[PDB]
A paper describes a structure:
In mammals, DNA methylation is stably propagated by DNA methyltransferase 1 ([name]) during mitotic division. Here, we report that DNA methyltransferase 1 ([name]) specifically ‘recognizes’ [name] via its first bromo-adjacent-homology domain (DNMT1BAH1). Here, we show that [name] directly recognizes [name] through the regulatory domain [name], which in turn mediates the chromatin association and enzymatic activation of [name].
To elucidate the [name]-binding specificity, we also determined the crystal structure of bDNMT1BAH1 in complex with the H414–25K20me2 peptide at 2.8 Å resolution. The structure of bDNMT1BAH1–[name] reveals a similar interaction mode as that of bDNMT1BAH1–[name], with the side chain of [name] surrounded by the same set of [name]-binding residues (boxed). Along the [name], titration of hDNMT1BAH1 with the H414–25K20me3 and H414–25K20me2 peptides gave dissociation constants (Kd) of 2.7 and 4.1 μM, respectively, compared to the Kd values of 10.6 and 17.9 μM determined for hDNMT1BAH1 with H414-25K20me1 and H414–25K20me0, respectively. Mutation of hDNMT1BAH1 at or near the corresponding [name]-binding pocket residues (D768A, Y775A, E819A, and E821A) significantly reduced its binding affinity for the H414–25K20me3 or H414–25K20me2 peptide, while introduction of a W796A mutation largely abolishes the hDNMT1BAH1–H414–25K20me3 or hDNMT1BAH1–H414–25K20me2 binding. These observations suggest that [name] has evolved with a conserved mechanism for [name]/3 recognition.
Numbering used by the authors:
A (entry chain F): 18 to 25
B (entry chain A): 724 to 842, 859 to 897
Write the structure that this text describes.
Amino acid sequence: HRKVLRDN
Amino acid sequence: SKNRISWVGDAVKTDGKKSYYKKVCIDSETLEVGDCVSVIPDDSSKPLYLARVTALWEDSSNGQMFHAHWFCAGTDTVLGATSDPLELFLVDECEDMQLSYIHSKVQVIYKAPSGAGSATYFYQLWYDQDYARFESPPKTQPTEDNKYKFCASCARLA
Ligand SMILES: [Zn+2]
């Protein structure tokens, strides 16, 4: 399970 | 924002696909396994995410990575808010994550169980009951003529 899904 | 990222020391284990390290330099700061770290959420408005850095490695696939072991605050629990913004809770939430996502290095301590401590009264301020105010304690001094029975409030109320 992930909690940070942005990309940059 | 982490843009200059350099490993510190030679690798400690190699997967033949990952290469693990004990320390990394990011900007000027140096960060080891076990240090704690701050991450801005997807919602910039929400409070910062805090984590322990449990591993650092370079991936053939993905780049320069770490494993975040999250903390959580009261508001992520049955408790709702909590009295101290600095309060945190262990929780079993993890994630691999790019090192460039690290906002800042932070300090997180463990607070061992304490005892009740000295239950004595204390004062800090003076209350002017006529004008309904708090001041710093008046510094009215006694003579050596009346030291043996001096009452500061008698002295001022005369
Ligand atoms: Zn984990």
